[PDB]
Amino acid sequence: MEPKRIREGYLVKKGSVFNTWKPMWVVLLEDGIEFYKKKSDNSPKGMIPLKGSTLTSPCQDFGKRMFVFKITTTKQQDHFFQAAFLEERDAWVRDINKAIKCIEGLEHHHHHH
């Protein structure tokens, strides 16, 4: 009903506290991926620009355990987060990287004339 995001779920993201790794709620939207702690902590912990982010798969030595990839928002903001399994690892990183690669071609204001 109210909830209207492209791909929302709950994965652990490392970026907000003192360098750690804890599960969290995150919703990638077609205009930006904003994630909080629960389906709606009511206050987002950090957002991701849907244009200028990178993807690292595999990732670096930051976990490299189950399925943890590393993204780099145009603001040099690394994002090492792991899903619950491979299917959710490529489905989450592909949905966030897809929306970011889709906004680069989804602009408005046409100047045909």
From Swiss-Prot:
Function: Major protein kinase C substrate of platelets.
Residues carrying N6-acetyllysine: K64
Organism the protein comes from: Homo sapiens (Human)
Parent sequence residues shown: 1 to 105 of 350
Protein name: Pleckstrin
Domain PH: 4-101
